[PDB]
Design a protein around this ligand. Structure first.
Ligand SMILES: [Cl-]
Ligand SMILES: [Cl-]
Ligand SMILES: [Mg+2]
Lengths: 269, 282
């Protein structure tokens, strides 16, 4: 019988998650392991419900659980849980991201091209509510940039709608940083729709590095994650945890990854 | 005990060949939505790795599920054998003895898509097929949907060309760019699917051709990406909620005994509709 790994993701509609999942599945499958995916973005389910569903059929779980590290690791007992993009708590392992680095790099690009009226589009429903949003706000406030916060539901359509309304109230906006690439694609459509040229009238920078970015027009500049690297980070950590090479909950079980700036056509740099 | 979740639940496996063609995550999400709302558990096996086949996916899922819904890449019959009386619902292939099947009317789609190009009087049409032409003197249509389009264009006496490329946006862009160097007159392009169409739009843009003014583009699938492209992609589509409902409702009927496995009523044929966006005119 082969090792079976459960993969929990909050949806399949943000294209980041199927790209992430495909990477993990590739690396696990090449080890001869089986993977089952639970897309829990339906019926009010949570990351904890995902782990409860998967646990009887898996030896381990890799998951974006949205805050349930402690309880999920307890459901799993001695089977390692590797959580992504959240507080590691009592989870066996964790992969997190350097948002202060990403914030510095992305903001730098907009400072380099002399953008004077920046907006940050955050995912949510006044103040940034996300770790990455807080980092971007942090850097813009440290620099003293004149900037504004836009909050919208995390879909391209909700991002378009919010960007469109904001542009009407703030027509001079010339740099937009988006919470992720899905929302950025909506921003680009609001810009196109309003008659603005990109990047000449307004630049756009996303986050994630989804393949979709290469197919937009203009092509999306973004803080990209190397999806092979994120997959390898999770799978190697799991090999370590299963083999005893890595001690659950130790420093060696907490990994931090960095994004890299990929310039395409939605910036001038 | 009163506080707990009650009743042991149906478990359904979903087999998909990859998660990199955006159709498959959209399809999966729609099926997971409907199943989840019936209180069912669902697990997805993305088998597009390690040389695995749709049969391997079904072999893996079988012991932890009561039924499978999948795109199996030609292994329907053998997969239903593995599953025994646990129902398989396959899509888009010859179902053999599978308990249930959903197929699409590609003659109808071809007629509708071609009609749009005729209405706009495109004179030099190209169909971009998913596949390879390494074993023949020139490209020939290899997919069911592709044969249907070639059939329609031959029937209408159109002067048309066939392009073949691997089913990725980048392979499509590269094959479209090469073709457009040789055939600059091309003014309408039908693509195997939306992902390939996104590549075609990039080749047209790279070649200095306006879409739709100089060249129209029509895809197939109705993936949400089509609304984010510029121009937004006109496409032959069915609502993924309908495709999802057709599969789950078939499985409900098979599990309940309302539908006999393998019977005529266990085979559903769905029809795409033309969704006009910006990559066509009129
Ligand atoms: Cl810029
Ligand atoms: Cl047209
Ligand atoms: Mg013309």
């Amino acid at each position: 019988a082969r090792t079976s790994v459960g993969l929990a993701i909050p949806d399949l509609t943000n294209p980041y998650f199927p790209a992430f999942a495909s990477s993990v599945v590739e690396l696990a499958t090449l080890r001869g392991w089986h993977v089952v995916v639970d897309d829990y973005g339906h019926g009010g389910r949570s990351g904890l419900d995902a782990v409860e569903h998967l646990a009887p059929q898996v030896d381990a779980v890799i998951g974006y659980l949205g805050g349930y590290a402690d309880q999920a690791q307890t459901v799993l007992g001695r089977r390692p849980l590797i959580v992504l993009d959240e507080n590691p708590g009592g989870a066996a392992g964790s992969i997190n991201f350097d948002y202060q680095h990403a914030a510095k790099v992305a903001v730098a690009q907009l400072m380099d091209s002399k953008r004077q009226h920046i907006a940050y589009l955050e995912a949510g429903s006044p103040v940034p509510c996300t770790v990455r949003g807080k980092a971007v706000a942090g850097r813009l406030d440290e620099l003293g940039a004149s900037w504004s916060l836009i909050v919208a539901e995390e879909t391209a359509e909700a991002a378009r709608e919010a960007a469109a309304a904001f542009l009407r109230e703030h027509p001079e906006t010339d740099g937009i940083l988006a919470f992720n690439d899905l929302m950025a694609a909506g921003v680009l459509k609001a810009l196109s729709g309003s008659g603005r040229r990109v990047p000449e009238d307004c630049a756009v920078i996303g986050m994630d590095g989804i393949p979709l970015g290469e197919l937009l027009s203009p092509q999306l500049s973004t803080m990209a994650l190397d999806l092979r690297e994120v997959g390898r980070a999770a799978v190697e950590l799991l090999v370590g945890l299963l083999s005893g090479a890595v001690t659950p909950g130790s420093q060696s079980s907490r990994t931090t990854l960095k994004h890299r700036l990929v310039l395409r056509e939605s910036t001038e740099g």
